[PDB]
Design a protein around this ligand. Structure first.
Ligand SMILES: NC(=O)c1ccc[n+]([C@@H]2O[C@H](COP(=O)([O-])OP(=O)(O)OC[C@H]3O[C@@H](n4cnc5c(N)ncnc54)[C@H](O)[C@@H]3O)[C@@H](O)[C@H]2O)c1
Ligand SMILES: NC(=O)c1ccc[n+]([C@@H]2O[C@H](COP(=O)([O-])OP(=O)(O)OC[C@H]3O[C@@H](n4cnc5c(N)ncnc54)[C@H](O)[C@@H]3O)[C@@H](O)[C@H]2O)c1
Ligand SMILES: NC(=O)c1ccc[n+]([C@@H]2O[C@H](COP(=O)([O-])OP(=O)(O)OC[C@H]3O[C@@H](n4cnc5c(N)ncnc54)[C@H](O)[C@@H]3O)[C@@H](O)[C@H]2O)c1
Ligand SMILES: NC(=O)c1ccc[n+]([C@@H]2O[C@H](COP(=O)([O-])OP(=O)(O)OC[C@H]3O[C@@H](n4cnc5c(N)ncnc54)[C@H](O)[C@@H]3O)[C@@H](O)[C@H]2O)c1
Lengths: 337, 339, 339, 337
């Protein structure tokens, strides 16, 4: 219903719109997309995922500048500058930075200059930029929050339940890492890049790196300041990743209890946000899964009743896309205008 | 012994410099590198290969515009502008296009205007104005001041050209249409991403890619008696880095065996095309040819005949390593053709 | 509507049962599974696919000899002994060889002695005693009591047979030698390991593998007018699964275009070979055909001509999914041929 | 010099003999090999690694039952039963279980029945079986230790330096995990296996699992009883792996100090056993590396001056093979007979 716009049409926005069309009563409405690619090119592209596969809905280029989605036409634009983009023209309520380049307040500001109402970001807002997360700060979302972001799917996976865990026993501290799958942030072959690791081919190489999660959790949970500083392991898969973490909780306990509380939360509020998996399952067993998190209760363990190893997966985009969905819906909430 | 500068430090140029320092008596002097990537990174990059690994000798970084290798220092530039490269200052005899950007003659001549003596294209010239010289093919037919900016098409081409030439030479090939198994490269998309060719635009690591190659023309280029004689499409395997082709052709002979040819194969490969060409016999697979200086390696147990003249052939090559060696010895010949 | 039992729960059988439950009105009743792997594991295995994923419906485990699917229960056996399978007890009309073990007639007849009515081989019979029946090919030519143990060679074969038949039918093919791009399978070695064929014995995930296929014979089997007309070798790509082949043939026509054929291609594919055969037009790559019931999908932009009659063709298939559907509808026909 | 024999000629024994021939003054001498494969088959096989590549030495089948190594002929046998194997025949001093099936005392005992002097094992001895590790218990090796094993390369990587770390600050506890690469222990495609995870294709799928390391470290260090319980993550690479671990040490400190002590140890005794890597490096950057361990000092960190995240790599076989080498040499040591 609400007029939406996506920008920097990465696989992120692709899966995103795939969910949006697949979304049951999407209260939102994307109307245009920007990315360097072309109309039929992008249409073909999105028409076939390399993980889900083809789109279970005809998408043709309805017009040479727009594409249909079973008749649902959406304008396709291509530029590297938000001011060149029909925000005030199309009266765009919301632009979605997928380029990853407008990690600044200013970057989003360009869209507002071209006539954007609000700007949301799939990336960790580089600098003092708010990021709302379902079951986390989503209530802190105000309509005054016109410029807010979303950190890496990795982060968002961790945030809520580890919050509850600090709320369950009280996590004194504990750092992590993630089996993160590679991406465009890592050059296909060994090509020059800001990060040598990211510069590496890595198609056949595990990449050690980091993520703002180490602080993004402290970001979303100022309470969690410094209690965790985890790094990122870009793994040679293209897919959904799982996360490692051992924490130091204040209250002593056993893993199974933590797992039970996990299920409980995945019923009370983490329902739909979180799942608890107990079967022997691997990355394949978590695809197109809408719960941001899949607790491997079957394997989570605790050392000294305080040092709590945990296993839970998260889809590189699909789950993240769903996060984008419902946060955008929350934006449609508190949307008197 | 002659000034050289790589124009664009592609993985191709990386393997190339590996061979150059790995060269016995390289008559050429690669002194400065072009790539807008920072010298520390570069040093790292070459210093840490994937397909084979770290340089099997020291690499250091003298002043971060200009690193070193085993004491031997190397200048570096980092630009996309041709004129902004000190070909004139550094007095570079030869440009090594390692970007594929200037598939045009003029694009290369830009660096000549920036003070270069000659340009070689490590790629198929999109135009035709540039001699796509090939070892064992037209390398002998190369002349100084004869378009001192010459080109060199894909390994894909170069792997095929010479021996198939010898094949239509000793036996005569009516026609044929090849098809390779190329391995993904930077032009392919690690993940489905905005890109011109729909095919290589897809996630490379998880898709064989139907594409074509200029080779089928380049071969007809280098073999005008092959004009419109060969077609064939490029199959891009999500394989790390191993190049290999097949092709069935109709011979112009009586319809001889393939075996006899394999004999003649290795013969010429052992004859005029020593080192250049291989015809192995061991039943081997992709990895069984990593870092092999042979422009091609045939396995007899593969090449066969359908209809006497309808005859099949299989052989391999490293899209860079061999190709690198090709660049090496052509430049060395160029150096001999150099005054 | 007719009793069935899979003999060996290969990934092939997994996809097969996926299609069976995914079948609209499957006239057949797969009731018990054979694989020495434990029912809980099995339920898991099928319940968690790689190439496409979890069964898109419930699977449960009734008594751990005998699990269920969506309430519909399924017996399971677990043995390598043919006679030790309750074909007689369970009254199974048809054996589904999902091991490739009994590439011999007698091996299959063992299960008949254990009380089976018929056997189908989901593989090329190493002997010849068994009719390698194929959809759109000899499926019509199948008869009851006519070697009630019939066979079915590799997807590789089945993908190629029918349409190339139609090609030599409408246009006439002198000869030709194919070559596919097969995806690694269990016979291949994830890592270099003790194994008969040197090639697939290598680490599969990191090597294209030069092998052959019985197809070039199987096609001549099913097409006796193709006796010794086709050769071609199997190229095993380290990709999960996205079977695809190419082949250049000399047509017996005047030397017509390939385009016109692509028209005729889709025509027959839309004609007698609806659903069976596809000729797509969109420029697509491997993943662009996952879980496609078409035994083959041609793209026109690929198939071409070298010498008028020297004509190339490209098409795809899923070594199981399509092959699975083939098993399905042949058995259904068998069921029609069944009393 | 000492007559050696290898059994179950996995890629393990392959790389092993590749090092042995490449070994500078190998005081040992393999004379025969068993594995189900055949002579020319295996010769071809070993002649070409999929990681190092071909063997930099001609190996032909010197005889239809034996193969040369540049003339160094070694008998090739093929059986599934140690009693069928020329131990008392060839007067075999030592058999090397590579089959992984004789994880019992009894399994090794079969070779001794066929006339083996001592039996060494590339695997964690399933049950009460001694495993010696360089710089760890290698001194505890006695000539009376005729039946001793070697746990997974993963384990052996961890043991020595974490020992020193408990010896450096005093590791109260802390569990781990590893970016372990897949193997034959996991079915190439989804084929039936004891472990569903191991049963999984996993060619494209990270596998969560475990390893005796969690106890093998407590095994080799009874002092380390329960102080660590780490799991295994079989990653979709075929290659050298790296290890994750955060520990709880008693003495407070900073990572850089730990790294320095790491270097120091990799000089005093962990020299050749251990390296300290500080450059941005990935799996490719650690192949044919003989130090069992490559400390990524550049990335190791500590939480609360006690919770010590660490990064160090280990070659699936090559390094492990080297471990086999020098332990076998130690067997040639204390070898009065
Ligand atoms: N890998 C994931 O699924 C994932 C998960 C977490 C966060 N993210 C975020 O998603 C973004 C990357 O998306 P992706 O992983 O699909 O990669 P991607 O490279 O496919 O996305 C970027 C796309 O935008 C285009 N683009 C770049 N600069 C542009 C500009 N100035 N204007 C217009 N288009 C431009 C690129 O050509 C490309 O098509 C980043 O912001 C990243 O932080 C990605
Ligand atoms: N892949 C092969 O083995 C092969 C064989 C035949 C032809 N080629 C040709 O070689 C080219 C590069 O080889 P590659 O596969 O290593 O590709 P690549 O993209 O890895 O190499 C190009 C490198 O140079 C940089 N670059 C791009 N444009 C530049 C410019 N104008 N000036 C300076 N640096 C620039 C890129 O950012 C990258 O780091 C290709 O474009 C292709 O035409 C390569
Ligand atoms: N890969 C394909 O798509 C394809 C196509 C054509 C032919 N085939 C034939 O199908 C066979 C199996 O297909 P797959 O690729 O899934 O192989 P697979 O090895 O995964 O299937 C065999 C399964 O059955 C088990 N098994 C082996 N022998 C058995 C026996 N005697 N009784 C019961 N179970 C037994 C194996 O342990 C394994 O779990 C192959 O041997 C091949 O001949 C397969
Ligand atoms: N991935 C590794 O390199 C690694 C890690 C640590 C330890 N290990 C140990 O190495 C062994 C596995 O070696 P691998 O990883 O090279 O796998 P692998 O499967 O290649 O090794 C087993 C080999 O032995 C053969 N074999 C099996 N049973 C046999 C028997 N009864 N008699 C004779 N030969 C037999 C198999 O056919 C195969 O060739 C296990 O003991 C494992 O614990 C390996």
């Amino acid at each position: 219903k609400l007029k939406v716009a996506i920008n920097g049409f990465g696989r992120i926005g692709r899966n995103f719109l795939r969910c949006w069309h697949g979304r049951k009563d999407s209260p939102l409405d994307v109307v245009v997309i920007n990315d360097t690619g072309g109309v039929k090119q992008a249409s073909h592209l999105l028409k076939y995922d390399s993980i889900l596969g083809t789109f279970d809905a005809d998408v043709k280029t309805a017009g040479d500048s727009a594409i249909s989605v079973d008749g649902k036409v959406i304008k396709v634009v291509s530029d590297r500058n938000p001011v060149n983009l029909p925000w005030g023209d199309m009266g765009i309520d919301l632009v979605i930075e997928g380029t990853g380049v407008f990690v600044d307040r200013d970057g989003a500001g360009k869209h507002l200059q071209a006539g954007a109402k609000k700007v949301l970001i799939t990336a960790p807002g580089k600098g003092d930029i708010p990021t709302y997360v379902v079951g986390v700060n989503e209530e802190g979302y105000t309509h005054a929050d016109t410029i807010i972001s979303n950190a890496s799917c990795t982060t968002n996976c961790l945030a809520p339940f580890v919050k509850v865990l600090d709320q369950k026993f009280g996590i004194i501290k504990g750092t992590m890492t993630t089996t993160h799958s590679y991406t465009g942030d890592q050059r296909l072959l060994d090509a020059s890049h800001r990060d040598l690791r990211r510069a590496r081919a890595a198609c056949l190489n595990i990449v050690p790196t980091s993520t703002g999660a180490a602080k993004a959790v402290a970001l979303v949970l100022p309470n969690l300041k410094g209690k965790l500083n985890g790094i990122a392991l870009r793994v040679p898969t293209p897919n959904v990743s799982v996360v490692d973490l051992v924490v130091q909780v204040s209250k002593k306990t056993f893993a199974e209890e933590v797992n039970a509380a996990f299920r409980e939360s995945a019923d009370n509020e983490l329902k739909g946000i979180l799942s608890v998996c107990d079967e022997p399952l691997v990355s394949i067993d978590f695809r197109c899964t809408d719960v941001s998190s899949t607790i491997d209760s079957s394997l989570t363990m605790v050392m000294g009743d305080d040092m709590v190893k945990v296993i839970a997966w998260y889809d590189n985009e699909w789950g993240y896309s769903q996060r984008v969905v419902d946060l955008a819906d929350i934006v449609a909430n508190k949307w008197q205008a | 012994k002659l000034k050289v500068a790589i124009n664009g430090f592609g993985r191709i140029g990386r393997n190339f410099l590996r061979c150059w320092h790995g060269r016995k008596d390289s008559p050429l002097d690669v002194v400065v590198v072009n790539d807008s990537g920072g010298v520390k990174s570069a040093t790292h990059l070459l210093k840490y290969d994937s397909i084979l690994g770290t340089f099997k000798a020291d690499v250091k970084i003298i002043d971060n515009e200009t690193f070193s290798i085993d004491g031997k220092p190397i200048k570096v530039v980092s630009n996309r502008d041709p004129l902004k490269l000190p070909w004139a200052e550094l007095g570079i005899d030869i440009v090594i296009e390692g970007t594929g950007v200037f598939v045009d003659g003029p694009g290369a001549g830009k660096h000549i205007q920036a003070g270069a003596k000659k340009v070689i294209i490590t790629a198929p010239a999109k135009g035709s104005d540039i001699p796509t010289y090939v070892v064992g093919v037209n390398e002998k037919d190369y002349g100084h001041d004869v378009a001192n900016i010459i080109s060199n098409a894909s390994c894909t081409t170069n792997c095929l050209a010479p021996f198939v030439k010898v094949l239509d030479e000793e036996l005569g090939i009516v026609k044929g249409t090849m098809t390779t198994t190329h391995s993904y490269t930077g032009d392919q998309r690690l993940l489905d991403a905005s890109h011109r060719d729909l095919r290589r635009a897809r996630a490379a690591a998880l898709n064989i890619v139907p594409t074509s190659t200029g080779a089928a023309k380049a071969v007809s280029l280098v073999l005008p008696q092959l004009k419109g004689k060969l077609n064939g499409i490029a199959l891009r395997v999500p394989t790390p880095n191993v190049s290999v082709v097949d092709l069935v052709v109709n011979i112009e002979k009586v319809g001889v065996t393939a075996e006899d040819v394999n004999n003649a194969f290795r013969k010429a490969a052992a004859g005029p095309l020593k080192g250049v060409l291989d015809v192995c016999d061991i039943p081997l697979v992709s990895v069984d040819f990593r870092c092999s200086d042979f422009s091609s390696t045939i396995d007899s147990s593969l090449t066969m005949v359908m209809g006497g003249d309808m005859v099949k052939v299989v052989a391999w090559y490293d899209n860079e390593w061999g190709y690198s060696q090709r660049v090496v010895d052509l430049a060395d010949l160029v150096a001999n053709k150099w005054p």
